[PDB]
Design a protein around this ligand. Sequence first.
Ligand SMILES: C#Cc1c(F)ccc2cc(O)cc(-c3ncc4c(N5C[C@H]6CC[C@@H](C5)N6C(=O)[C@@H]5OC(=O)C5(C)C)nc(OC[C@@]56CCCN5C[C@H](F)C6)nc4c3F)c12
Ligand SMILES: Nc1nc2c(ncn2[C@@H]2O[C@H](COP(=O)(O)OP(=O)(O)O)[C@@H](O)[C@H]2O)c(=O)[nH]1
Ligand SMILES: [Mg+2]
Length: 169
Amino acid sequence: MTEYKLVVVGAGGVGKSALTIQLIQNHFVDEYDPTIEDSYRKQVVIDGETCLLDILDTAGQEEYSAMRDQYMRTGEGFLCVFAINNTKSFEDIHHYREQIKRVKDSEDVPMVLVGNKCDLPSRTVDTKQAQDLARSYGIPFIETSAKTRQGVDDAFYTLVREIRKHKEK
Ligand SMILES: C#Cc1c(F)ccc2cc(O)cc(-c3ncc4c(N5C[C@H]6CC[C@@H](C5)N6C(=O)[C@@H]5OC(=O)C5(C)C)nc(OC[C@@]56CCCN5C[C@H](F)C6)nc4c3F)c12
Ligand SMILES: Nc1nc2c(ncn2[C@@H]2O[C@H](COP(=O)(O)OP(=O)(O)O)[C@@H](O)[C@H]2O)c(=O)[nH]1
Ligand SMILES: [Mg+2]
């Protein structure tokens, strides 16, 4: 059975843990310990293929050891998450994209840009800004809400499809 190692990255408070728990448990968790980094498995069928998705929900004090670089290098695909109500989280996307490219040593790593919290009315990052950033990286952009589940399956399944495309190159 094919396993896909997915890693969820992005600034604190964007909803990385809430997205992960909405995917694995179909529930919205209002409080998930901000400091805790952990991984979960979900078996799903995507385009007819039975998948094992191993999701790593990143967290913890900012550190850059050789061991952390090797841990992040295990990822096959990355969800780069910002929150639509937080301009700084969107501005930080470049940093996360560059750390992925740094440890993978490649200009072609499967990634999806995720604009989370789309259920909130206070949007400070318009869709056009994020669509432009994603087109500049050659990756898909998807808006999600971990609260309502809008776009959640689409974000993770689109990242699996990017990994499949990459393996065919
Ligand atoms: C990811 C990642 C990553 C990759 F995607 C690929 C290879 C990596 C290889 C590496 O070795 C390391 C990392 C890595 N690990 C942690 C990171 C991290 N955390 C983790 C999360 C998110 C913010 C805060 C601190 N968090 C928390 O969970 C905190 O724990 C809490 O509780 C919070 C207070 C919520 N912060 C940042 O950057 C934050 C900024 C803002 C301040 C300066 N810094 C520089 C820019 F400006 C942006 N970068 C990080 C980083 F690159 C790698
Ligand atoms: N309204 C709403 N709140 C969310 C959503 N995702 C996360 N949150 C909330 O935002 C805060 C941070 O979420 P969390 O998953 O801990 O962010 P992380 O630090 O990226 O893991 C919590 O209070 C969550 O309930 C969402 O899509 N909509
Ligand atoms: Mg978290």
